[model samples]
Target chain A: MITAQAVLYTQHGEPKDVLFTQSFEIDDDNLAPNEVIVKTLGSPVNPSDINQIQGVYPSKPAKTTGFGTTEPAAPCGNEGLFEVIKVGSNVSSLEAGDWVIPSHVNFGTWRTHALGNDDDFIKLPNPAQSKANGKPNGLTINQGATISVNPLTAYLMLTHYVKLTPGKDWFIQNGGTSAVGKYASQIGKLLNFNSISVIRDRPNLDEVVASLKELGATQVITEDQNNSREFGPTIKEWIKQSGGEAKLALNCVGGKSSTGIARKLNNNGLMLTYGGMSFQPVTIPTSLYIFKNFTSAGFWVTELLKNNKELKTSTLNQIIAWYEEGKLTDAKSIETLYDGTKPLHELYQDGVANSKDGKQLITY
Target chain B: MITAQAVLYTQHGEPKDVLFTQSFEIDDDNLAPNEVIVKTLGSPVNPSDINQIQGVYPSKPAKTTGFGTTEPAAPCGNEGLFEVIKVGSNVSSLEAGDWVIPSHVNFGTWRTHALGNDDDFIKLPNPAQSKANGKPNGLTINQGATISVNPLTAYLMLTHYVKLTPGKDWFIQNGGTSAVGKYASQIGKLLNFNSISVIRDRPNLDEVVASLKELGATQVITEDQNNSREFGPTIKEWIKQSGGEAKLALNCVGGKSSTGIARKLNNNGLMLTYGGMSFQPVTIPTSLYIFKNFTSAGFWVTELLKNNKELKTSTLNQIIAWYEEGKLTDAKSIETLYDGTKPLHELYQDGVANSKDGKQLITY
Candidate 1:
């Protein structure tokens, strides 16, 4: 028997209490025909994963596996990077000692080791080794793990719904400071399309704007500036002045902010929502739809990966390539105060309490 | 001075007493370049024109022409056919005694003798006469007058918004027994599309269905049949059994019926609303938009004709040709009990009271 440390959800209420530390033993009985034992390198607690642990998120797992006293449930993580230490006999593509990333919605990423189905471990292409050997380079495991959700959301919203002719401008996330927004901006630049990003007015607004510009944001407007009722007329005049208009408007904020953004789009333009951080209902004026013939829609990455295999693979591969090319980098990690005075579970509790900084990774 | 009889709206509010019969003197000041004076042969009362006279509709004229001493308002009618009695020097396309139609909105068709810009008149091609001499067959006055609004609405909604691929089936419309719906049904049959029409279950439903079938409706369903939530699942099962699903859903009822029909559409499908009869708001569940990635839009023929010259000309020409071919027919006209007894203004009042039966044509 081998012991594995994992984050456990003992209760199903607040994220802090339910998500703590636990240890479990694994045996051959738990092995499947197409399974791999992965030694965890790193995993980040995503917003969706935190919500899942709190029993608020949609993609909840049926079973926890190897972590409960009698029968285990999910180990309380949705995404992570891990090194494949062992592969079941049936798993030919992924072997021992290879870095990999999980696909689809799954449990137990906050662990020292995990047994995953062959389908879960996407074998990321080794860029450094491939370059050293003068072979074709693909994406790395760290990059692959962080991608699949946001990048795919951007790609699907931009490409599938609206046709983007090269050099035609488009709008995506004004919250351009977010990881997904930055990636979307960069992708738009690479594809020869312009991006209009929305961001909040912060003390570091100029720095944020410059950073996003480096990622290919053509225009950046603060939230306060964009929320005016006259924004539509202003955008129309801008379009006329620039001799171009946006084909799509992307929103993560679902309140009046989204509505304001939608007004900037050209006729037959699309407004797509993938996230709702503000927790407000999306309101669109019927005239925009009934008179001007605009379209408004939403997307969830969890559903996309579950239903579409080719898109999943393609999105992961694309992000991986970008990471290898040094065009993409990891999101800035916000440090949490972790002192060894308290049990690791207490640190998790503290981390959960202060999660606005995002995922808390423990280091000894 | 020649006296011309026309219906005039003297005041805003309810259209009951505000509209009255008035006489006006014909003057050359009203004439413009490429203008033609026409003697009204047939003028049909439309709902929008009624709404306009009532001052409840969106479109309002900048200045009303001569309707008498009451107000600046002139004769108010949106569409009609007129015979050209006189033509300005630059009006080369339309000769004296030629038939013509008004292409612009608020041109005042509810008058015995009217002056119109030559640009608004569409010259119908008489194929039989043209074939006989290998020359251009001029338009008939009656065909020209009745050819604009309803037919153009049907054509634009079906062709431009939805991809009516030659063989694949499409569904559109509410109030299928209405004139525009009937025209759309016929157009669908003639074109490469099939129609599924929704109508209120009147006492004459069977007759309505049969009549619509004759006009080329593939299926006739009541609004209640579509209101059932099971309609989408049933359509899916039916499509699986029949081997095809509708790619487009046309909505004139912008409430629950619109939402239901939109749900049954195939992936990448389009739902277009050109009219709102339900009076209830159009409510769309975010799931239908996000997961299905469907499209919903609206169109106004008034706007289209005002904006797109080529499309307007093409659509009008097609309708006139269909009329010439004897394939397109007008709605069954209802005669007022007190026709000549009621002045032209009272005729409009009676027209509004009997609007359900459709356009009232005063035959003198």
Candidate 2:
């Protein structure tokens, strides 16, 4: 017999209010041919995952009583790093000692162990495996755990829409200090496209700008500079110096901030809104729409990639290669080891509470 | 010698304040090798023309002393119909008695007569020519004069981005009473696609609704119904009955009205903004963008058709064919003939002042 513990909820509400742990037994001795057993390595708390718990997000996990509950219950966590502890005889794609992550969202990452079909998790090269393969670097626990969202978002946004001419086109983005923004700035430079990052006025503004600059951002400007019409020519000067037009804008903060980023784009430029941190709706000037022939559209990573398996796989491979080459760095997370001092639900709940501090990762 | 009279503006301001008459000699007896003489038949007062006069538009005519002025001045009007009264010995594509319109905007169409190279204008068959070719009907002066803006805008917006399957896919639009909106409804039906037109609730609501229905609108609803969240499911019902998604939306009016139309489109639907009738910028809810994957974009007929002469000519041919078959109806204009009774500029000034009465056409 194999014992499993998963953090789950019977109804929608606050995670702290509705979440609890449920223990179940899987007959590992009589394993199905296609089945594999995975143990939790690490899981991170994301805003969308919390929203899904609150029943305010579009994607949701199915509630079922397969976990030995009298009532249906839904599992918690959408992103987690896992390890293959055992595999059934017919499971060819994965083996014991392999590092993995859920193949899709809603795989109940806030759990001790899960028994499922081989395809439920995607394989990632373990550090020893990377060393044997003579790679420069290996996927860190942080990178593997959080790869499904932020880095993927930045990669897709930079490549999905208008193809930038390698050396002569640029992208401008607000939320320059956000995780995705930093990743985009790096990935854009790696691909030889110029990038301008717009960040808010901060107490440690110079330090923040220097960090982004080290990440390969061509230039970083303050919100005040981006918002001022007088500063328009300064951007023009930078663009001309770089020999490119700002053809794409990534907007996560909607409102005046979005307008400032969008105004920096060239004629017929495109703006993609992936998140609205300000809680304000996306706004564009009428003249931009009519005269400048601008296009303001949204970018939802899940929706764009749900059915596009080839694109998703290809994108992941590219990011993985960069990681192996030590050419890419991930956004660091505040780590909390699951020492078995408290219930599994309590572990995730604590991670949720500390989300505002920075990204939180619970490792078992 | 033939004298030409043009409505000219030496500086940007209100049409009444800046407009004046400029008379010049054509020297008809000694025409340039490539020169041809065209006499204006009619021109319409379009909103964009007014915007150009106010210096608020992006595409501006260069103020040059080409017309032999002490101070540089640019001619007024963009869309107009003309008759070829004389052609130089070397002119190839045109002859005397040919009917034509300026090939591009900012050609100074508000003139009694002008001499230019054959390339300055493109040819359109006259009524007699259409009849002689055994066409079912001839292009009316009204249709010819108003062909460049509203009709072109409507046609391009409907066909540009998404390929709506005929007889099934639907497009929903606000501003059903506006010229381009009416044309869109008619064109959608002509292409065998479905259309839903939303008009402002008026005292004679039923009358206006009936008239639009006669113009081939698949569905007509009040702005109140469109604005109500409860009305969303109703639009979905209409769209489902049409056997396809409301994949396209046309937005001439921005603000909440734009939002109302945007909400009706299916997932991944595209909303195009061509005119801001409400004078407000476009506003979209965050969820619709992030979850529904909606895209808001702009359309400018001038910008699109500026560099693509092949597309423009092909589109014009399609509309011309439909007109010849008597299957397309033009938006009507209130006639104000140019009888040489006042300065040409003053006639246009009166038309600009009385623009609220209806679409104004200056005919010679």
Candidate 3:
């Protein structure tokens, strides 16, 4: 028997109040032929993870007493990096020492160890494997763990809906400094598509704009510039310099900010709203709908990638190559190391509170 | 030679301020081989026509001296029924006594007679021709005159973007009392799909609801009912009875009302906006978009029908068949017959002023 620790909740509530550490047996010596045991390497405190704990999010893991609890309990976390510690005799796809992540969400990632079939997790090339393949850099632990959501979202939205002509088409977006927005700009540049990033007004606006431009943004403008009718022609001229039209808009901010991005698109353009940080509903003008032929849709990576293995696998491969080539960087996370001495639940609770300061990554 | 009368505009402004009557010569005796002459049977004063005169509309009829005016002048009116008075030598599809509507908008329908190429108009079978074909009823003048916009809009919107299974799917809409909404409900019943129509609360609310139901609505509810969360399950029950889900929402009144109807859709549903009579922008909740996978898009009849003649012709055919079979009735028009003695422009000015009373139709 392999003893493991997992963070779980018997009832939905605040993370600090409901989260508790459970010590359970994995039964590794009597494992099913196709089953393997994995130990948690690293996991991040994502916004969705906090929401899942609060029971406010749409997708959730089911609570069960499979761990021998007196009452049913649900595990925490959706994203994490793991290493195969042991494999059943019949397991051929994965062996001990291989790195992997949950194949899908709600894998009870905030845990010290897990036991599942070969297909329960997706394999990733570890540093030694990258060296064997002659890559410039191996996948960072953060990149592999966080690769399931933001970066995948940017890549899909950039390529999925509109077939933008690389050199002759453009995509505009609000939240130019957001994690997903920054990833989109980098991917757009790498793909040779023109990118016009719209960011909010800041005291050091010029300084901020300069850094975004360095991150592969073709152009950066303030929200006020995007809202002005007088400034419309100038932006048009900039895009037209390459004879490309703005065909897509990535909106993380809603309300007037969503409208500002929609206004910049050419006739028959699309705006995908992935976030609404402003707490305001998306407000689209009637003329934009009737005359300009604009479309507004939402993007939920969890829902889109839920059942599509081929698409998800191809997307993950593309992202991994970028990370390996040093063409992509994961959103930096403030790392917290967890040793066997402390409770796993308490460690994650600390990481949860530190989220707003910067992203929190708990590693074992 | 034949003398023709037309309502003309030299400048964009209020309809009463810029409209004038122009008398021109149509060279019937010396016609171009491809040109044919048509006399207006009836024309309606649409909101779009008023906007065109005010220069607020996006598309406009070309202003030219081709009608023999020294200064540039543009003819007015877009939706009208006309009779073929004479055909040029090379014309084959249309003959004298055939009924027709402009092949495209901005054909300047507010006129006694005009000459244009054969491709400029689409032919419709007159009453005698309908009788010859053994139909129960023929096209009503009002149905033919207004067929180019409202009914076509409702039909295309229901069938164009998404396909809902006929008996097991539903569409919910605001503007239940509007012309397009009524047509949508009637068409929904005709096509075997369930419809829930939302209208404003009024003193004669029951009476209005009864009439709309008579027009074939599956369910009728007030805006207040739609706005209330407690009323949600009641609507769900109504659709649940048919084992169907509300998969589409047609929004015309924006603001909170738009949000009201959008809230009723099942996951991965769509809300399409074609009008904004409330003079407010469309507002959608962020949760509905992200959690339910809801999408918001715009629909424009003119832009959609502009180039796709095959779709336009097929759609118009379906509507015409319904009308001729006595299965569909048009939104009744407040008819005002035109006499040559009264200036054509003055007649339209009166119609525009009486718009709030009911839609105005001028028959000559």
Candidate 4:
């Protein structure tokens, strides 16, 4: 029997107030034919995870007494990297020493170990596995765990709806320094699509611009430049010289900022909204809708991939390929090691607090 | 030779300042193989015409020397009815005593008469012709003259983009008392699609509500009722009982009013913005776009019909069929007789000013 510790909550509230540790046993000797055991490698604190803990998010894990909680409780975390330590007699697809991640969200990833069916998780290449397959690199724990959200969002938004002609068409987005934005910039470069990233006017604007440029942004402008009528001609000149129109806009910051990026698109363009970092409603000129034939729509990765398991698998494969080829880079996390001095839930609570400084990850 | 007077502008400016009367002779003695002569019956003052004269509208008449002016000039008006007086040897599609409308805009519909190729105008059934064909009704002069804008706008917006499943679907819109709005209500009834019309809080609210209900609005709400969070349940209940969802939203009011109407739409719904009476930008909550999968787009009659002649013809045939069967009503215009006592430009100038009271139509 293996003892597993997990963060569980019987009620919805702030993470610090509601989260607690529960230890349960997994019987290794009498496993079902399809069962497999996985040990947690790393899990990260995401905004959605925090929202789900507070009961503010729409998608949630089902609560149950199956985890030996006196009251029905749900586990914490949505995304994490894991390694298969054992497999059932009939489990031929996954073997011992294989790396994996959950096939879907709401699997309660923040745990020391988990026992599940072989199909409950998807496999990824470990360092040895990649080297044996003659690949140049392998995914780090941070890269594999965080692969399901921001990179997928950026890549899908760029390629799924509208097609941008290589070397000609362009996409513009606000939140140029965001993880998704940076991935979009890098992916845009890899795909040979022109891109303009709009960032805020800050003291480190030049450095931020340089970094985005290094990541493959064709142009990086501040919000002021995006909103200015005087700067319109400059963007037009660049696009005109490139021989393509701006056909897509990715909006994370709403309000006037949304309108700014939308205006940069050509006639019959599409703007996709995935986040509201500004906490303001999207404001668009009536003329743009009527005369320019522009459209504004939402993009929710959870809903988009919910029914399309094949797309999720295919997208992950492409991303894994890029990571192995050393053509893409993952966003670094503020890693914290679990030393067992404190409870698992307490370490996660501290991670949630430390997330304000940067992305936080717990490694066991 | 026939003398014709038209309102012409050599330079773009305010109507009162730049408009002038230009009289030119049409050679009736020497007609081309496919030439036809038509005398104007009626023309209406539309907002787009006013904007075009000021050079603010995107679609504009090409300034030309074809009108026999010393300086290049363009003629005024876009929607009008005309009576054919003569046809050349090769003209078979039209004849004397037939009623017609311009096949396309920029035909200078405000002129007393025009000489053009036979294909320049589309034929509409005269009252006598309708009676001879055993129809119960015929198009009134006001109906035919104003048909190109508001009626077509309403009909196409309801039918073209999104498929509203008749009794199983509903559409919501602000500006429920506007010309286009009234037409939409009537058309919605004719098409068996439920409609909710939202108007401003006026002193005679009951009377306005009754009038809209008479025009076939399923429900008439004030801006206050539309915006009230408490009123949401009542609307949902009404829709639930009707076995339909609000699938489409028409936003001419923009601003918060736009937001109110958009909220009534079901998941994956579409909102089309055709006007902005409030002069404010369209504001939408970010969650609606991300979670509900809503889409906002613009609707422009001119642009939509520009490349698709067949759609325009089919749409008009449907409206004309309804008029002949007495199944539809046309919005009445505030009519002014063109007595020829004033210069043509002067009468049109007065009509432009009088348009504020209601839609202004000049009859010959």
Q: Which residues of candidate 3, in runs, are more than 4 Å off?
A: A1-5, A13-35, A66-71, A88-92, A339-354, B1-5, B16-33, B64-73, B89-92, B340-346
TM-score of each: 0.71, 0.93, 0.91, 0.93
lDDT of 2 by residue, A125-181 (tens): 888888899998999999888887788899999998999988888899998988789
Clashes by residue pair, model 1: A64-A73, A64-A74, A139-A320, A174-A197, A174-A198, B80-B145, B81-B145, B99-B141
**Displacement of the residue B300 alpha carbon in candidate 4, Å:** 1.6
Per-chain TM-score, chain A, candidate 4: 0.94
Q: Report how far off residue B110 is in candidate 3 (Å).
A: 2.9
Between candidates 1 and 2, the one scoring higher on lDDT is 2
Q: Compute the lDDT of residue B95 as modeled in candidate 4.
A: 90
Whichever of 1 and 4 has more lDDT, that candidate is 4
**Considering TM-score, which of the candidate structures 1 and 3 is the better prediction for this target?**
3
Which of 1 and 3 is the better model by lDDT? Answer: 3
Look at candidate 2 and give me any clashing residue pairs.
Answer: none
Q: What is the TM-score of chain B alone in each candidate?
A: 0.88, 0.96, 0.95, 0.96
Task: Kindly list the per-residue Cα lDDT of model 3 for residues A1-364, writing each as its tens digit.
Answer: 8888889999988898999999899987888899999998899888788889999887888999977698999999998999999998899999998999999899899988999998999999998899799999998888777877878999999999898998889999998877787888889988998999999898999898998887778999998997889998888898788898999998888988888889889989998888887778988988888899888888888888888999999999999999889998777778888887889899999998877566788998
The true-versus-predicted C-alpha distance at residue B5 of model 2, in Å, is 3.6
lDDT string, candidate 3, B84-117, tens digits: 9888889998999999999888989888887899
- Runs in model 4 lying further than 4 Å from the true structure: A1-32, A63-73, A342-357, B1-3, B13-30, B65-71, B341-356
**CAPRI-style class, candidate 3:** medium
How are the candidates ranked when ordered by lDDT, highest leading? Answer: 4, 3, 2, 1
Error of 1 at B183 (Å): 2.3
